[PDB]
Amino acid sequence: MKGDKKVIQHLNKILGNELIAINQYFLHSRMWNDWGLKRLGAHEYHESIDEMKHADKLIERILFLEGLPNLQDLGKLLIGENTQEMLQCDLNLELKATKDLREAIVHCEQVHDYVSRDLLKDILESEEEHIDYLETQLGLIQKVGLENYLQSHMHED
Amino acid sequence: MKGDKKVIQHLNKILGNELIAINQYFLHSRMWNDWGLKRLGAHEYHESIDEMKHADKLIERILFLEGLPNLQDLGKLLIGENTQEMLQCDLNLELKATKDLREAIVHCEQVHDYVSRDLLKDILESEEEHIDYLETQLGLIQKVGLENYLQSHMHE
Amino acid sequence: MKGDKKVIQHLNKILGNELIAINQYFLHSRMWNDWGLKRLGAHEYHESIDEMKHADKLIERILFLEGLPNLQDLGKLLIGENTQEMLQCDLNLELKATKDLREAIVHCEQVHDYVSRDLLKDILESEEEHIDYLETQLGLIQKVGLENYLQSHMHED
Amino acid sequence: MKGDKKVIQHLNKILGNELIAINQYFLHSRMWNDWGLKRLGAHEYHESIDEMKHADKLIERILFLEGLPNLQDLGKLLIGENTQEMLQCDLNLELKATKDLREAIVHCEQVHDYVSRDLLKDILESEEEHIDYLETQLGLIQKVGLENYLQSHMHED
Amino acid sequence: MKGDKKVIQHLNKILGNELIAINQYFLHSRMWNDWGLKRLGAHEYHESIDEMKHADKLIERILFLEGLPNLQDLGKLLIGENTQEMLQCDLNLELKATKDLREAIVHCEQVHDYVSRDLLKDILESEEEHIDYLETQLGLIQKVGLENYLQSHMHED
Amino acid sequence: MKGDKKVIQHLNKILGNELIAINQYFLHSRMWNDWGLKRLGAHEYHESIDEMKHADKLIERILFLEGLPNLQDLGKLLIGENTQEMLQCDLNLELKATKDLREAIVHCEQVHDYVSRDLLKDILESEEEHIDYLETQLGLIQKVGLENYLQSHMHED
Amino acid sequence: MYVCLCQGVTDNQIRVGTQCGKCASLAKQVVRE
Amino acid sequence: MYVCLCQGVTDNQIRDAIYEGCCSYREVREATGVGTQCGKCASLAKQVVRETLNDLQ
Ligand code: HEM
Ligand code: HEM
Ligand code: HEM
Ligand code: FES
Ligand code: FES
Ligand SMILES: [K+]
Ligand code: NA
Ligand code: NA
Ligand code: NA
Ligand code: NA
Ligand code: NA
Ligand code: NA
């Protein structure tokens, strides 16, 4: 078995985080579409797809390292009731995800699994870009007002 | 005469409902265009067209079953005076339409007219999508405010 | 309201006539299709569509003039039971329609609503073309015989 | 064996009906061609092909359900001697077919084989469209006269 | 009636053989598809179609000669239970078919129906090609072994 | 709330089954790729994607009916240790899925939710096609032998 | 909303039926309230 | 089959732990880690333990 056991635990932890995000973002997307906020719905749909792609890369790496990917343990989804609360739920989730990614990276570095580190760093860059998006949307709600913010997200690009 | 008499009565009733909707939606469309809400006008025009196509299929089915399509009796149009009321009027009409579709389908199933059932099922799916659209708009008025909602429907 | 009250009544009267024609022609079309006289069916379908387009223009004009278009009152459809009766029914309807159009035009002229007059004149020209078509078909039945006439209308194109 | 035995019997009954129709329509088609009524011959050829396609779908469904498709029992072909009698033979056959389809559907519904029901419903729609065609042709013989009706079917579309 | 009565009987006999082969090959095809042997299923489907085309030409020739094509009588299908038996069943059917074709040709020559002879000789050539294919397949089972032979026919070309 | 409460419970139950299948098929896919059985990996990836699309349609329908789609509850995955066990695990899952779909359809019919019934019937048709594929694969293992079966799935199409 | 389209009478104007009469029942109701 | 995906425990590994001296599910769990994470497998793991101990008689 070529894989370090704690590296595999860390990868499975990040994978578990991605699985929560997949489902949370997908449900939020479909809620925004049901409400007629199609621009938000489309954007959130693409966030969910992106997490699916990260999950796939984690699953493949775990198997290469001779571990078993954990697709069974699904943690708590943070579902909002309205647009602002949904954005904040996505942000709370991402802040927990990035903390775990950083710890995973520390450990990879310590045991010299430089390829797993590089994978996790790429995921981290993407998650930080998501945090940038989320903080921006919450800022815009304050700058343009909620009613305008929502109006601007009725129609798709 | 191959058609069941109660099936033909049900199909004529649904046709009656589509004929009301055609006229109501067409008038609402042209009122929205008159007011310069052209995106609502265009959307509503397509709803009217879609009802026309359903009416066509009902007429064709009634004739195949050797019934007499009734295009003479036009029921009551629900015409609103402002955007919010026009949308609610379309919704009230649709709630009645779908109730009648379900009853027609029950009857077709009972007398084994499975093809008439499938025609009605397809109509019902379309009318349910229209309900989805109507509730969504009424909800947007609440979420973005009436002035923004109308603004968003000025331009196609 | 900017429009003359009797102009609006006239336009609503013409609209009322178009609404009868739309349904009468549409039903005749589908009866002909049901019987396999597809060429008659297709031609009558286009007559129905043309009446719809006239109705649309009347509705638009009535709203511009600040009247209320009447789509609620539907008068008597003249439905025939065979080809000869259906054509004569359409002709009977068109003769009444053109009489009302001329009376409406007289009134628009008197109150200087020249744009409404021009719209009505355009509809009138179309209805007179339909009369020509109907008189021609009735004449062809006499000339070629009913059986040949119907045969000639079985296939489209 | 996943299939309900009576569902399989019903499917084999419909299959048996399609096999009769395949042969009856094919022979009628080739008789119309021999007589120089090429438009009828072509149309009837396509009716035969359509029944072949229905038969194929039944055969595939029976095998999926772990039954044995019955291509051995061929019922009575109703062959006509002249155009009107051939059309009526096709109609008599279709009226028996649609009765069997409806009974099959009742049974599928009762045992919750909703996919077999949907297959049979699609077949039924097609057979009813054939009945519409047949009733139309017989009506046209009366409206335009037999000699004109036949003339109109000499040349292909 | 321009046709020799015994020629027409021979043509109907060949037709009857083609009609058996259509159904036998079609069922074998669909059985192979059900089992996932798609290359055999596809090849056998095309054999069925080719028999359909021969039957058509036979029906056309019988009509020209003013006989009655017989599509009502369907003899016994030979349906196998596994790939080796199905191939052998097709081969048994084809050896009977070619014997009948040779006897039909003899009689055509005797009564100077050279066009019917030519049609039968064309069919004979096709059935001999089918015999070649069948003997080849049965030989390949011996040379490559049954498991390899079936493997090679899982995926379509 | 326009939706029948028990319909929504049934739709959530079907959703829960789809969510299990997404993860089970995705993991089986990636396991097969890891082992170099790329044709199985690719086929199973597409099965996972198809379950994702069903889940989407379910979530959309539940929202329209004004229920709460449940993406939080993830039941037990059946993950096999070798190709034969993995296929059987998928098949076990699918037999449970189709039983639940039939029960959901019964209830839809009873409360006249014909559009929800139609959606479920479409899903049922797809799951039955998957059952067909699985039984076929397990049958091919027997017919061609396990080593040949695996060989045939090393290289992608 | 319009109670009578023929005459353009809204429910608020009531708070008619002379032309086609399809609205009579509704107008009579708005009145009986 | 994998009985526990979180800890990668198969039904054969549960039998092995019993054959090697585990006397109960709790002992198998200490030996293998089965059911120590999400817990969704616990009832299936218990069933395998139960069947195994019963067959050992
Ligand atoms: C383990 C969990 C999942 C994984 C690893 C996963 C992975 C993937 C991948 C790799 C794709 C292809 C992306 C691309 O390259 O375009 C995809 C597509 C997609 N996913 Fe997932 N997915 C998961 C769960 C879900 C769930 C739970 C849903 C919905 C509730 C979902 C909805 C979709 C949809 C709608 C598509 C697009 C499919 C198409 O139309 O082609 N996924 N997924
Ligand atoms: C107020 C009454 C009606 C109005 C104002 C109206 C108006 C129109 C208009 C403007 C079009 C588009 C024409 C074009 O640009 O080519 C149209 C199309 C059509 N109409 Fe009507 N119509 C009316 C009633 C009906 C009825 C009662 C029926 C059938 C029962 C019908 C059947 C159709 C059909 C089948 C089309 C073509 C739809 C397509 O694009 O597929 N119409 N109508
Ligand atoms: C079990 C009975 C039969 C079945 C299941 C069957 C099925 C089929 C199918 C699936 C096709 C392809 C249709 C397409 O997609 O274009 C076909 C074609 C055809 N069939 Fe049949 N068939 C049967 C019997 C017959 C018979 C008895 C005849 C003639 C007497 C016939 C004449 C033809 C002809 C001429 C074609 C066109 C072939 C070509 O030129 O490509 N079929 N059949
Ligand atoms: S709607 Fe009031 S009279 Fe016509
Ligand atoms: S599956 Fe065993 S603890 Fe999660
Ligand atoms: K091999
Ligand atoms: Na205006
Ligand atoms: Na909505
Ligand atoms: Na001839
Ligand atoms: Na007809
Ligand atoms: Na199979
Ligand atoms: Na590997």
Side-chain angles (χ1 to χ4, degrees), chain D residues 117-142:
Chain D
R117 168 175 170 145
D118 199 47
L119 175 56
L120 295 173
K121 178 275 288 184
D122 288 337
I123 295 179
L124 177 59
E125 179 170 25
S126 166
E127 302 302 350
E128 293 192 352
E129 294 173 4
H130 196 183
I131 287 165
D132 189 358
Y133 168 85
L134 290 166
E135 289 175 338
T136 297
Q137 302 325 110
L138 296 159
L140 283 169
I141 284 167
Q142 296 303 315

PDB file of all heavy atoms in Angstrom, chain D residues 117-142:
ATOM      1  N   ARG D 117     -47.466  -1.211 -20.328  1.00  0.00           N
ATOM      2  CA  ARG D 117     -48.650  -0.420 -20.655  1.00  0.00           C
ATOM      3  C   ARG D 117     -48.312   0.711 -21.633  1.00  0.00           C
ATOM      4  O   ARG D 117     -49.041   0.969 -22.579  1.00  0.00           O
ATOM      5  CB  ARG D 117     -49.276   0.193 -19.409  1.00  0.00           C
ATOM      6  CG  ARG D 117     -50.323   1.262 -19.776  1.00  0.00           C
ATOM      7  CD  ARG D 117     -51.054   1.804 -18.546  1.00  0.00           C
ATOM      8  NE  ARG D 117     -51.851   2.962 -18.928  1.00  0.00           N
ATOM      9  CZ  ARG D 117     -53.030   3.301 -18.415  1.00  0.00           C
ATOM     10  NH1 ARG D 117     -53.604   2.573 -17.451  1.00  0.00           N
ATOM     11  NH2 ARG D 117     -53.633   4.378 -18.877  1.00  0.00           N
ATOM     12  N   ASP D 118     -47.217   1.403 -21.372  1.00  0.00           N
ATOM     13  CA  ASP D 118     -46.846   2.563 -22.177  1.00  0.00           C
ATOM     14  C   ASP D 118     -46.537   2.105 -23.607  1.00  0.00           C
ATOM     15  O   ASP D 118     -46.920   2.756 -24.567  1.00  0.00           O
ATOM     16  CB  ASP D 118     -45.625   3.234 -21.540  1.00  0.00           C
ATOM     17  CG  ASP D 118     -45.425   4.680 -21.986  1.00  0.00           C
ATOM     18  OD1 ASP D 118     -46.389   5.468 -21.995  1.00  0.00           O
ATOM     19  OD2 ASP D 118     -44.276   5.032 -22.309  1.00  0.00           O
ATOM     20  N   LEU D 119     -45.860   0.969 -23.755  1.00  0.00           N
ATOM     21  CA  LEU D 119     -45.604   0.412 -25.084  1.00  0.00           C
ATOM     22  C   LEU D 119     -46.890   0.155 -25.838  1.00  0.00           C
ATOM     23  O   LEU D 119     -47.044   0.548 -27.004  1.00  0.00           O
ATOM     24  CB  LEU D 119     -44.819  -0.889 -24.964  1.00  0.00           C
ATOM     25  CG  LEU D 119     -44.561  -1.670 -26.251  1.00  0.00           C
ATOM     26  CD1 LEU D 119     -43.848  -0.802 -27.270  1.00  0.00           C
ATOM     27  CD2 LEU D 119     -43.733  -2.904 -25.926  1.00  0.00           C
ATOM     28  N   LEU D 120     -47.829  -0.514 -25.171  1.00  0.00           N
ATOM     29  CA  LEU D 120     -49.110  -0.841 -25.786  1.00  0.00           C
ATOM     30  C   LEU D 120     -49.915   0.410 -26.112  1.00  0.00           C
ATOM     31  O   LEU D 120     -50.581   0.471 -27.135  1.00  0.00           O
ATOM     32  CB  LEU D 120     -49.927  -1.737 -24.860  1.00  0.00           C
ATOM     33  CG  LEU D 120     -49.257  -3.106 -24.646  1.00  0.00           C
ATOM     34  CD1 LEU D 120     -50.010  -3.901 -23.595  1.00  0.00           C
ATOM     35  CD2 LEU D 120     -49.213  -3.881 -25.933  1.00  0.00           C
ATOM     36  N   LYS D 121     -49.851   1.411 -25.252  1.00  0.00           N
ATOM     37  CA  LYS D 121     -50.560   2.653 -25.543  1.00  0.00           C
ATOM     38  C   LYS D 121     -50.019   3.309 -26.824  1.00  0.00           C
ATOM     39  O   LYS D 121     -50.788   3.745 -27.698  1.00  0.00           O
ATOM     40  CB  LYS D 121     -50.501   3.567 -24.320  1.00  0.00           C
ATOM     41  CG  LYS D 121     -51.149   4.916 -24.494  1.00  0.00           C
ATOM     42  CD  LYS D 121     -50.205   5.917 -25.129  1.00  0.00           C
ATOM     43  CE  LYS D 121     -49.111   6.354 -24.160  1.00  0.00           C
ATOM     44  NZ  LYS D 121     -48.268   7.403 -24.805  1.00  0.00           N
ATOM     45  N   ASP D 122     -48.704   3.306 -26.991  1.00  0.00           N
ATOM     46  CA  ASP D 122     -48.107   3.860 -28.198  1.00  0.00           C
ATOM     47  C   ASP D 122     -48.577   3.095 -29.441  1.00  0.00           C
ATOM     48  O   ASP D 122     -48.905   3.691 -30.470  1.00  0.00           O
ATOM     49  CB  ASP D 122     -46.575   3.850 -28.098  1.00  0.00           C
ATOM     50  CG  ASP D 122     -46.035   4.901 -27.109  1.00  0.00           C
ATOM     51  OD1 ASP D 122     -46.738   5.905 -26.830  1.00  0.00           O
ATOM     52  OD2 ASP D 122     -44.895   4.727 -26.615  1.00  0.00           O
ATOM     53  N   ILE D 123     -48.608   1.771 -29.354  1.00  0.00           N
ATOM     54  CA  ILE D 123     -49.089   0.959 -30.464  1.00  0.00           C
ATOM     55  C   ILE D 123     -50.549   1.322 -30.758  1.00  0.00           C
ATOM     56  O   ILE D 123     -50.926   1.514 -31.903  1.00  0.00           O
ATOM     57  CB  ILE D 123     -48.927  -0.544 -30.167  1.00  0.00           C
ATOM     58  CG1 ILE D 123     -47.439  -0.855 -30.053  1.00  0.00           C
ATOM     59  CG2 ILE D 123     -49.609  -1.392 -31.245  1.00  0.00           C
ATOM     60  CD1 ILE D 123     -47.126  -2.313 -29.733  1.00  0.00           C
ATOM     61  N   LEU D 124     -51.346   1.469 -29.707  1.00  0.00           N
ATOM     62  CA  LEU D 124     -52.763   1.765 -29.858  1.00  0.00           C
ATOM     63  C   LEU D 124     -52.970   3.106 -30.565  1.00  0.00           C
ATOM     64  O   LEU D 124     -53.842   3.241 -31.417  1.00  0.00           O
ATOM     65  CB  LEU D 124     -53.440   1.793 -28.488  1.00  0.00           C
ATOM     66  CG  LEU D 124     -54.921   2.155 -28.480  1.00  0.00           C
ATOM     67  CD1 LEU D 124     -55.761   1.175 -29.328  1.00  0.00           C
ATOM     68  CD2 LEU D 124     -55.398   2.220 -27.037  1.00  0.00           C
ATOM     69  N   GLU D 125     -52.166   4.102 -30.216  1.00  0.00           N
ATOM     70  CA  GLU D 125     -52.284   5.398 -30.876  1.00  0.00           C
ATOM     71  C   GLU D 125     -52.073   5.248 -32.383  1.00  0.00           C
ATOM     72  O   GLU D 125     -52.805   5.815 -33.208  1.00  0.00           O
ATOM     73  CB  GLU D 125     -51.282   6.398 -30.287  1.00  0.00           C
ATOM     74  CG  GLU D 125     -51.354   7.753 -30.958  1.00  0.00           C
ATOM     75  CD  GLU D 125     -50.540   8.846 -30.234  1.00  0.00           C
ATOM     76  OE1 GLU D 125     -49.569   8.509 -29.511  1.00  0.00           O
ATOM     77  OE2 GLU D 125     -50.885  10.046 -30.393  1.00  0.00           O
ATOM     78  N   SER D 126     -51.083   4.458 -32.752  1.00  0.00           N
ATOM     79  CA  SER D 126     -50.761   4.233 -34.149  1.00  0.00           C
ATOM     80  C   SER D 126     -51.885   3.486 -34.869  1.00  0.00           C
ATOM     81  O   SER D 126     -52.228   3.805 -36.014  1.00  0.00           O
ATOM     82  CB  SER D 126     -49.441   3.468 -34.236  1.00  0.00           C
ATOM     83  OG  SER D 126     -49.215   2.941 -35.518  1.00  0.00           O
ATOM     84  N   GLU D 127     -52.469   2.489 -34.199  1.00  0.00           N
ATOM     85  CA  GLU D 127     -53.525   1.710 -34.831  1.00  0.00           C
ATOM     86  C   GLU D 127     -54.773   2.592 -35.040  1.00  0.00           C
ATOM     87  O   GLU D 127     -55.435   2.498 -36.070  1.00  0.00           O
ATOM     88  CB  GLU D 127     -53.880   0.441 -33.999  1.00  0.00           C
ATOM     89  CG  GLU D 127     -52.703  -0.557 -33.716  1.00  0.00           C
ATOM     90  CD  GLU D 127     -52.006  -1.115 -34.973  1.00  0.00           C
ATOM     91  OE1 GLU D 127     -52.513  -0.913 -36.098  1.00  0.00           O
ATOM     92  OE2 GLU D 127     -50.936  -1.763 -34.840  1.00  0.00           O
ATOM     93  N   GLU D 128     -55.101   3.427 -34.058  1.00  0.00           N
ATOM     94  CA  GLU D 128     -56.220   4.373 -34.199  1.00  0.00           C
ATOM     95  C   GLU D 128     -55.965   5.353 -35.339  1.00  0.00           C
ATOM     96  O   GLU D 128     -56.889   5.720 -36.077  1.00  0.00           O
ATOM     97  CB  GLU D 128     -56.484   5.143 -32.901  1.00  0.00           C
ATOM     98  CG  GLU D 128     -57.020   4.276 -31.732  1.00  0.00           C
ATOM     99  CD  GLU D 128     -57.554   5.105 -30.566  1.00  0.00           C
ATOM    100  OE1 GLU D 128     -57.385   6.341 -30.580  1.00  0.00           O
ATOM    101  OE2 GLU D 128     -58.146   4.532 -29.624  1.00  0.00           O
ATOM    102  N   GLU D 129     -54.714   5.763 -35.532  1.00  0.00           N
ATOM    103  CA  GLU D 129     -54.435   6.634 -36.676  1.00  0.00           C
ATOM    104  C   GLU D 129     -54.686   5.872 -37.977  1.00  0.00           C
ATOM    105  O   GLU D 129     -55.159   6.445 -38.966  1.00  0.00           O
ATOM    106  CB  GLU D 129     -53.007   7.185 -36.613  1.00  0.00           C
ATOM    107  CG  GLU D 129     -52.803   8.126 -35.438  1.00  0.00           C
ATOM    108  CD  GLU D 129     -51.343   8.561 -35.238  1.00  0.00           C
ATOM    109  OE1 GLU D 129     -50.488   8.186 -36.074  1.00  0.00           O
ATOM    110  OE2 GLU D 129     -51.059   9.269 -34.237  1.00  0.00           O
ATOM    111  N   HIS D 130     -54.391   4.573 -37.985  1.00  0.00           N
ATOM    112  CA  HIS D 130     -54.690   3.753 -39.163  1.00  0.00           C
ATOM    113  C   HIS D 130     -56.212   3.657 -39.412  1.00  0.00           C
ATOM    114  O   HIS D 130     -56.680   3.703 -40.545  1.00  0.00           O
ATOM    115  CB  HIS D 130     -54.087   2.334 -39.036  1.00  0.00           C
ATOM    116  CG  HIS D 130     -54.034   1.591 -40.338  1.00  0.00           C
ATOM    117  ND1 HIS D 130     -53.590   0.292 -40.450  1.00  0.00           N
ATOM    118  CD2 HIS D 130     -54.341   1.991 -41.594  1.00  0.00           C
ATOM    119  CE1 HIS D 130     -53.646  -0.083 -41.716  1.00  0.00           C
ATOM    120  NE2 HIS D 130     -54.102   0.930 -42.431  1.00  0.00           N
ATOM    121  N   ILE D 131     -56.971   3.465 -38.342  1.00  0.00           N
ATOM    122  CA  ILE D 131     -58.425   3.426 -38.452  1.00  0.00           C
ATOM    123  C   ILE D 131     -58.936   4.756 -39.025  1.00  0.00           C
ATOM    124  O   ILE D 131     -59.831   4.789 -39.866  1.00  0.00           O
ATOM    125  CB  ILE D 131     -59.071   3.156 -37.076  1.00  0.00           C
ATOM    126  CG1 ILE D 131     -58.863   1.693 -36.674  1.00  0.00           C
ATOM    127  CG2 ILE D 131     -60.558   3.471 -37.115  1.00  0.00           C
ATOM    128  CD1 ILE D 131     -59.133   1.436 -35.208  1.00  0.00           C
ATOM    129  N   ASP D 132     -58.343   5.855 -38.587  1.00  0.00           N
ATOM    130  CA  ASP D 132     -58.725   7.169 -39.135  1.00  0.00           C
ATOM    131  C   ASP D 132     -58.467   7.201 -40.641  1.00  0.00           C
ATOM    132  O   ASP D 132     -59.343   7.575 -41.428  1.00  0.00           O
ATOM    133  CB  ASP D 132     -57.971   8.278 -38.396  1.00  0.00           C
ATOM    134  CG  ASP D 132     -58.472   9.691 -38.755  1.00  0.00           C
ATOM    135  OD1 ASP D 132     -59.371   9.812 -39.596  1.00  0.00           O
ATOM    136  OD2 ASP D 132     -57.944  10.673 -38.175  1.00  0.00           O
ATOM    137  N   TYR D 133     -57.276   6.784 -41.061  1.00  0.00           N
ATOM    138  CA  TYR D 133     -56.985   6.691 -42.485  1.00  0.00           C
ATOM    139  C   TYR D 133     -58.014   5.823 -43.250  1.00  0.00           C
ATOM    140  O   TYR D 133     -58.527   6.225 -44.301  1.00  0.00           O
ATOM    141  CB  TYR D 133     -55.563   6.140 -42.707  1.00  0.00           C
ATOM    142  CG  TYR D 133     -55.288   5.742 -44.152  1.00  0.00           C
ATOM    143  CD1 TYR D 133     -54.870   6.676 -45.088  1.00  0.00           C
ATOM    144  CD2 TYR D 133     -55.429   4.421 -44.569  1.00  0.00           C
ATOM    145  CE1 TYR D 133     -54.629   6.314 -46.411  1.00  0.00           C
ATOM    146  CE2 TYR D 133     -55.186   4.047 -45.891  1.00  0.00           C
ATOM    147  CZ  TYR D 133     -54.788   4.990 -46.800  1.00  0.00           C
ATOM    148  OH  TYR D 133     -54.567   4.618 -48.105  1.00  0.00           O
ATOM    149  N   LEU D 134     -58.297   4.628 -42.730  1.00  0.00           N
ATOM    150  CA  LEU D 134     -59.191   3.697 -43.409  1.00  0.00           C
ATOM    151  C   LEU D 134     -60.620   4.247 -43.543  1.00  0.00           C
ATOM    152  O   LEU D 134     -61.206   4.159 -44.603  1.00  0.00           O
ATOM    153  CB  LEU D 134     -59.217   2.358 -42.670  1.00  0.00           C
ATOM    154  CG  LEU D 134     -57.925   1.561 -42.772  1.00  0.00           C
ATOM    155  CD1 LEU D 134     -57.907   0.416 -41.746  1.00  0.00           C
ATOM    156  CD2 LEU D 134     -57.794   1.044 -44.190  1.00  0.00           C
ATOM    157  N   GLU D 135     -61.149   4.815 -42.469  1.00  0.00           N
ATOM    158  CA  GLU D 135     -62.490   5.401 -42.512  1.00  0.00           C
ATOM    159  C   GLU D 135     -62.529   6.560 -43.466  1.00  0.00           C
ATOM    160  O   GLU D 135     -63.529   6.782 -44.164  1.00  0.00           O
ATOM    161  CB  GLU D 135     -62.927   5.863 -41.122  1.00  0.00           C
ATOM    162  CG  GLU D 135     -63.235   4.711 -40.179  1.00  0.00           C
ATOM    163  CD  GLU D 135     -63.552   5.184 -38.790  1.00  0.00           C
ATOM    164  OE1 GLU D 135     -63.144   6.317 -38.415  1.00  0.00           O
ATOM    165  OE2 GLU D 135     -64.210   4.424 -38.061  1.00  0.00           O
ATOM    166  N   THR D 136     -61.434   7.302 -43.530  1.00  0.00           N
ATOM    167  CA  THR D 136     -61.359   8.431 -44.458  1.00  0.00           C
ATOM    168  C   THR D 136     -61.430   7.955 -45.919  1.00  0.00           C
ATOM    169  O   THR D 136     -62.191   8.496 -46.721  1.00  0.00           O
ATOM    170  CB  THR D 136     -60.067   9.261 -44.188  1.00  0.00           C
ATOM    171  OG1 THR D 136     -60.150   9.807 -42.868  1.00  0.00           O
ATOM    172  CG2 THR D 136     -59.894  10.401 -45.223  1.00  0.00           C
ATOM    173  N   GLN D 137     -60.649   6.932 -46.259  1.00  0.00           N
ATOM    174  CA  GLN D 137     -60.612   6.421 -47.625  1.00  0.00           C
ATOM    175  C   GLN D 137     -61.996   5.898 -48.023  1.00  0.00           C
ATOM    176  O   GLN D 137     -62.457   6.155 -49.132  1.00  0.00           O
ATOM    177  CB  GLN D 137     -59.571   5.303 -47.761  1.00  0.00           C
ATOM    178  CG  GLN D 137     -58.135   5.700 -47.379  1.00  0.00           C
ATOM    179  CD  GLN D 137     -57.813   7.143 -47.753  1.00  0.00           C
ATOM    180  OE1 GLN D 137     -57.671   8.023 -46.889  1.00  0.00           O
ATOM    181  NE2 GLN D 137     -57.691   7.380 -49.014  1.00  0.00           N
ATOM    182  N   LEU D 138     -62.664   5.186 -47.117  1.00  0.00           N
ATOM    183  CA  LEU D 138     -63.981   4.657 -47.432  1.00  0.00           C
ATOM    184  C   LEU D 138     -64.961   5.811 -47.608  1.00  0.00           C
ATOM    185  O   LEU D 138     -65.800   5.777 -48.504  1.00  0.00           O
ATOM    186  CB  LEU D 138     -64.465   3.655 -46.368  1.00  0.00           C
ATOM    187  CG  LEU D 138     -63.582   2.406 -46.297  1.00  0.00           C
ATOM    188  CD1 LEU D 138     -63.752   1.691 -44.950  1.00  0.00           C
ATOM    189  CD2 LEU D 138     -63.854   1.461 -47.455  1.00  0.00           C
ATOM    190  N   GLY D 139     -64.846   6.848 -46.782  1.00  0.00           N
ATOM    191  CA  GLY D 139     -65.676   8.034 -46.970  1.00  0.00           C
ATOM    192  C   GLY D 139     -65.428   8.723 -48.312  1.00  0.00           C
ATOM    193  O   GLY D 139     -66.375   9.180 -48.991  1.00  0.00           O
ATOM    194  N   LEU D 140     -64.159   8.793 -48.710  1.00  0.00           N
ATOM    195  CA  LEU D 140     -63.800   9.451 -49.962  1.00  0.00           C
ATOM    196  C   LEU D 140     -64.357   8.686 -51.155  1.00  0.00           C
ATOM    197  O   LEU D 140     -64.816   9.296 -52.138  1.00  0.00           O
ATOM    198  CB  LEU D 140     -62.289   9.631 -50.100  1.00  0.00           C
ATOM    199  CG  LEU D 140     -61.688  10.778 -49.272  1.00  0.00           C
ATOM    200  CD1 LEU D 140     -60.160  10.693 -49.280  1.00  0.00           C
ATOM    201  CD2 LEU D 140     -62.140  12.139 -49.805  1.00  0.00           C
ATOM    202  N   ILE D 141     -64.355   7.354 -51.082  1.00  0.00           N
ATOM    203  CA  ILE D 141     -64.963   6.591 -52.166  1.00  0.00           C
ATOM    204  C   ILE D 141     -66.414   7.057 -52.374  1.00  0.00           C
ATOM    205  O   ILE D 141     -66.873   7.240 -53.501  1.00  0.00           O
ATOM    206  CB  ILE D 141     -64.886   5.078 -51.916  1.00  0.00           C
ATOM    207  CG1 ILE D 141     -63.462   4.593 -52.189  1.00  0.00           C
ATOM    208  CG2 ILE D 141     -65.872   4.340 -52.825  1.00  0.00           C
ATOM    209  CD1 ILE D 141     -63.170   3.206 -51.682  1.00  0.00           C
ATOM    210  N   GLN D 142     -67.129   7.277 -51.284  1.00  0.00           N
ATOM    211  CA  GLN D 142     -68.504   7.736 -51.402  1.00  0.00           C
ATOM    212  C   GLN D 142     -68.591   9.177 -51.908  1.00  0.00           C
ATOM    213  O   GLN D 142     -69.472   9.495 -52.683  1.00  0.00           O
ATOM    214  CB  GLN D 142     -69.220   7.622 -50.061  1.00  0.00           C
ATOM    215  CG  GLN D 142     -69.347   6.171 -49.563  1.00  0.00           C
ATOM    216  CD  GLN D 142     -70.065   5.270 -50.570  1.00  0.00           C
ATOM    217  OE1 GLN D 142     -71.105   5.639 -51.131  1.00  0.00           O
ATOM    218  NE2 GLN D 142     -69.502   4.089 -50.810  1.00  0.00           N
TER     219      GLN D 142
END
